[PDB]
Amino acid sequence: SGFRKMAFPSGKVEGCMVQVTCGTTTLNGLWLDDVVYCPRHVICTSEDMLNPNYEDLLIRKSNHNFLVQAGNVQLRVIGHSMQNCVLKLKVDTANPKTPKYKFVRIQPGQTFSVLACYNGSPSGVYQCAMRPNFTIKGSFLNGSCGSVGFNIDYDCVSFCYMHHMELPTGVHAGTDLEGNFYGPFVDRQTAQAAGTDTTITVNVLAWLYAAVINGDRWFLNRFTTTLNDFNLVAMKYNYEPLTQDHVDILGPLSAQTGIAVLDMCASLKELLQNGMNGRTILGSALLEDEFTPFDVVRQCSGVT
């Protein structure tokens, strides 16, 4: 029993983190096989960052200008290329600690662990969601760029995020490991505002199921609703629309608790309309939306 915001064990990803230095800019790189992946803005002077032309900036960089350090040993860079907003640095040594890995581009609402690093050294691990506006609400100081977000499936690390940007509002933006930004964000020190940070409805419901499973039942009510009726209330409260796809996904939790998805929807409807009235669910005074249905099943079943 008990339910916690839980990150994947970070060891497999700690084994991949290196320091990348280009001139006076130091950030983090991900070392998989003989490639080091890092944000392309490593080549910028914070003056370049106002309107960088990356292809033009990169012409001035040779392999030997990229200083790659794994622990206290230098890696020899034998190649470099730009893919979208990341640099791939070919090194002469395969990372001996390379885990089984995939690159995946996640959807909004999908959760992942972040290993926050500075100078290629891990500081901490935390759980995130890709927000519906394609920002993440991270913890990233200067030097944290190139820190990565991941899921683990037993022994296979799926890398879904590399950190690039803090928006003026202190939310975060980054790329998949093909260098493609989540959302409309660009690696330029310019005015970039996030859209509406809506609540991930299906995640909230997952977490209400986690609550029932863990004995927090006070908010269960006598009501049901319909997707269309629920969705009117959701819209009004800046909750994402709920689809039959989300209902299907919640089916296993529905089964385990014997609470119909639409009944739990009706419960969530009353919490939105009535508020918590100073009560808590799983030690939270607000509705948590950074647990996916898969996260809830995982932590409630104890997958390793």
Added chain:
Amino acid sequence: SGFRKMAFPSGKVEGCMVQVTCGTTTLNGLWLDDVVYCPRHVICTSEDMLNPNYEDLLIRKSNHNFLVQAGNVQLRVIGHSMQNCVLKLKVDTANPKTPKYKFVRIQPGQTFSVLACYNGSPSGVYQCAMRPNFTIKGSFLNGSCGSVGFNIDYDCVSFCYMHHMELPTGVHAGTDLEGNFYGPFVDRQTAQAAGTDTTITVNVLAWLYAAVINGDRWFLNRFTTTLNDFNLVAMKYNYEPLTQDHVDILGPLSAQTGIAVLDMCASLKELLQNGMNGRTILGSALLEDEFTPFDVVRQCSGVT
């Protein structure tokens, strides 16, 4: 910017987790040098658990009854002893991944990371505090016993907790790595109630400082207070008394923000008396108390 509930990177501790089996009971062990530490209740039939006599139960166990598995390789047990509520299993192989380590007994209010394991395999990592009633609010299913809590100081893992018990109320109890329970708890399936789960006042203040540092300032007020005046309000709200020791500890955050500790106390006083009024601080609708002042400084400075 941004502030997250952040666990230590778990890699150093993943390298220490083994499976311990005694008869039909499987749980987790911590492998440091040539010793495997695990809960002594590994020797119990859940029938033994009602009123176990551990010294008597242990007489019936030989080295070869303790099955220790690190990955998919068996360790040879060449010795076993009981220290308080843990077994020390001497094995013939030093853990080659043994990190620099200490055993520390933490005080209530102190935070640590837990690496939740099942069958010696990591499932997840999360951040905890030792509650003032010497429980922790964990996420632990059957098989999780012997999962450990730790702090890291650069390269030195301080182990402070091993998981043993879920109380009937679904809160958690365990030992330091000398086998001594935190609080008055015993490894027996009996009526054990926790005392008052009071709020860790100094941690709440730390987290209010983290909020100001990260731009969440709305709750800063025009008032100050005194320790004695603050403490009357704290008592009324089941907050731990604040000492000059806690004020001293908050000094660095006081300095960085230019907010006197007692001013921040007066802010916390108004939040207790007035509530949040539907507002959030660092994405929370309640006052977070599982960040220590050291945690706030660490994450706000980016220590690795």
